[PDB]
C-alpha cells in the first residue's frame, strides 16, 4: 500500500519515515512501531492511540489517515508536516520576542483545548511533540505523537498510570493522585517557561530531587534574564505551574489571559538573544540523551537513472594492464580513417547527385570558396543546389583523389586537403580530364561530422 | 633537529612517528614520550631505557641513534623498520608452516641471547615488540621497544618490581620471587605457542585466575590442532614453559634445540591455515581493548576508504551585458576577435617580410595550397621562404580584407576565410590591384594559435 522513503525522527520503540501511498501519489509520515519490543499492554494500547488520533481534527494537530498491523510491526500513518521542531526553528530565526513565544503557546493551547473538549489528555507534552507544518515563513505549530495519550470521562479524575517525561511531570502524577486534564497545563507552563528563557524550571541530576522540586513548585525567575520579561508572562506561568490541579488555569482560561489575547499591548517585542543562545544548548543536550535500535531491516527505494546527452565510445582499451607503458605517443591513427570515411561518402554523394545526403554532411551555414562563385564567398547550400538539380541529375565519370593530407585538431575538429582529378566526356567524347585542389574543414557536432567550410581551386 | 611525519604506532604513554633528521636527510622512528603523564620514577628510568638501547648492537634489535628531553616530552630516536608487526604479516602470507615459525623464533632468540650477554633483561616480550625490518620478502624480525627492560649483574637474581603484560608474565614474577634472565624465556615460550596454533597458552577473563594458571603451568596441547605439530616443537615449548626458572631452557640452549638448529629435518613443512585464521582474531582482539581513560588535544576522526562520487560541474559561464547603453545588440565570444588578432599579426608579418614571426605562427608541418605551387600541395615553410627572402625584403603596398568569416570548432580549433585585395605598384607605377581568396586553419597548440593549413586562390 505504501512506499517508505527517508527517516524523519525516532523514539525508543518507533521511527518515523516519510512515505508515499502507492495508488494515491500522496505523501505521509509513517510511525513504525516495532511491536516485538513492546509490553503486551503497550501493544494493546495502540488501539487507544489509533482511536484518539482519528478523533482529533484540528488545524494545530497532525491527523491520522491509516493504521495497519503486520506480524512484527504496527504502522500509524499521519499527515506529513515538514518544518521540523519548533524549538530547532526558534534558534535559526533572526528575531525572537515574547510576542513570538505568545503566538507559539497560543497555538499549543488551542490544540490542547481541542483535545480536552474531545476527552483526550496528552500526558506527555514536551518540545519533541511541537512540530512546524512546513518550512514556509509563519508555518503553524502542530502537535504530533499521542502515544501516551489517554481518554477521560468528562471531568472525572483517575489513576491512569505513572507515565510522562521527568521534567514535564505534574505534581499530582508524582504524588500518585488521581488526575486528568490539568496535567497537560502543567506541562504547558514548563514549555512556556523554556520558550521565554531557554532553560527548564525544574532540573536535577538526581531524579528523586527533581521530583521533590516539582512537587514543591520550587522554580524561580532569576535575574538578569527574567528582569526584562513582562509581569504578565510571569503571571501566566505562575497560573499554570500551580501545585493544586483544582486551582490550575485551564486551556480555555489560559487562552483568555492578556499575554495571549491582548498580545499586541502586553507581550514584549524585544529580541531575546540570550534565550536563543541557551535554547541551542538545551536543544543539543536533548539530542545526546537517546538510544539506537540494534538492526535496520528496511525495503529498497527506486534506483538508477537514464543517461543525459550523447558521449563518444572511443577506442576500447586493449586490456586492464600490461608491461608496455599505456598511451604511447607514436601509433597508427584510426581517427584519420574516420575523416577519410566521411570524405569518401561526400564525394560519392556529389557524384550521385544526391543533394539529400549532401545536406546532412554539411553545416547549414557552410562557408565556400569555389570558381563557380567567381572569387566570392558563398554561405549555405542554396548555391550548390543549382548544380545538384541541373548538371548532376549523367555520363560516365571517374574521380581520383591524390595526395590526401589530414590535420586533426582535437576530438571535434579536422581538416583534409587533397587533389581531385575528374575524368569525363564532353558532348561526343573525346575523353577529358580536369584538376582541382580541394580543402574540406570538418567539425563534429552532436556526434556527426559536418563541413563548416570548403575551398576549391581551378575547376 | 628533526621533522615529524606520520604516526606508526602507540602505547598509553608514547606514540611512535616517522621522522627525518633535517641536516642529515636520514629517516628514523621517534618514540615520543609524554613525560607529564609518567610517574617521577618512570620518568627517571628513561635514563636506563636510553642506556640499555645504546648498548644493544645486533641485527635483530632496532638501535637507538639519539635521546632528547624538552619541557614536557622525551624523544628516543631509533632506526626505522618499515615492515610492521611480524604477527600481522604472518596472516597476510600465502604459506605458513612450523619451519617458518622456527625461523621467527630463532631470530627472536638470537636477539634475546644478545640482550642476556649484555646484562639486559627485556621483561615485557610480547607480539607488539616483534617488527619486520622492511616490506621486502624475507625481511628480518627485529625487537623494538625496551621501555620495561632492566640491567642485571651477571647471573644474580633480584626483585626489580612487578612489571610486564599479564599473558606473558612468568611464574616467578607472579610469586614475587627474585628474578632475572629466565623471565624472557618464559615469554618466548608463550610467543612460540601462539606462533604454532594462533592462540595463547594462558587466558582467563578473571586476572587472578589467569595468574594461578600461569603459576601452575596449566597449559595444554589440545586436539585437533596440536595433533599435526611435531613432538620436537612441543618439547621446546615445554622446556621454555617450565615453572622453575632454574630448570628453564636458556636462550643459548634453545638455539641448539633440534627444532631450531635441525629445522630442515625436524620442523614440519605443512601449511597451517587454522593457525593463520586464529591469529587473525588474536590480532584483532589485541587492537580493540577499550582504554581505561581517554586523553587528547582534539576528538580525532580516522581517515581511509575511497573517494567515489563527486561528479565534476559542466562549468559554462554567462557573459554580463556591458552597463553603458549600446545602439546595436550583438554578442559573439571574444574568441572570434582572438582569431582576428592572430590573423592581423599574420598579414603584418607577411607584409613586413618578417619570416621569424611568420615561423612562430605556423606549424612546422603546415599544409598549403597556393597558385605559387601550381596546383600542388606544399608542406612546411621552406616554400614560402623564397618569397620572404627575395621579394618581400619593398615599395608601398596596402592590403584590404573583405568579408571575413570565422568558424569556431571547439576551444582549440578555428578557421577563417576572407578576400584579400592588394594595392601595389609595378615597375614604374601605374598603380595596380590584385584579388585573392584566402582560407586559414588555426589550431591552438600549447597555448598558441598556429596555422596547420591554408588555401589561396587567384594570386
Numbering used by the authors:
A (entry chain A), B (entry chain L): 0, 13 to 404, 407 to 472
Q: What did the authors write?
A:
The Ca2+/calmodulin(CaM)-dependent protein kinase II (CaMKII) α isoform is a central mediator of synaptic plasticity that underlies learning, memory and cognition. A hallmark feature of CaMKII regulation is autophosphorylation at T286, which generates Ca2+/CaM-independent ‘autonomous’ kinase activity that persists even when the initial Ca2+-stimulus subsides. The principle domain sequence of a CaMKII subunit is illustrated in, with an N-terminal kinase domain, followed by a short regulatory domain that contains T286, the variable linker domain that is subject to alternative splicing, and the C-terminal hub domain.
A 3D EM density map was obtained at 20 Å resolution by using a combination of tilted-series tomographic imaging and 3D masking routines. The central density of the EM map is well defined by the crystal structure of the dodecameric hub complex, formed by residues 345–472 (cross-correlation=0.95 at 20 Å resolution). The structured N-terminal kinase/regulatory domain, containing residues 13–300, was best fit computationally into each of the radial densities with the regulatory domain (red ribbon in Fig. 2a) oriented towards the central hub complex (cross-correlation=0.98 at 20 Å resolution). Therefore, for the basal-state holoenzyme structure determined here, each N-terminal kinase/regulatory domain was covalently connected to the nearest C-terminal hub domain by a random coil peptide chain, containing residues 301–344 (red and grey coil). The pseudo-atomic model presented here provides a representative average view of the CaMKIIα holoenzyme in an extended (and activatable) conformation. In this form of the holoenzyme, the kinase domains are arranged independently from each other and removed from the central hub complex. Each kinase domain is separated from the central hub complex, extending the radius of the model to ∼135 Å. Neighbouring kinase domains are separated from each other by ∼60 Å (center-to-center distance). In this extended form of the holoenzyme, the CaM-binding sites (residues 294–314, red ribbon/coil) are solvent exposed and thus positioned for activation by the Ca2+/CaM-stimulus. Single particle analysis revealed a high degree of flexibility for kinase domain positioning, with almost none of the individual particles completely matching the average structure.
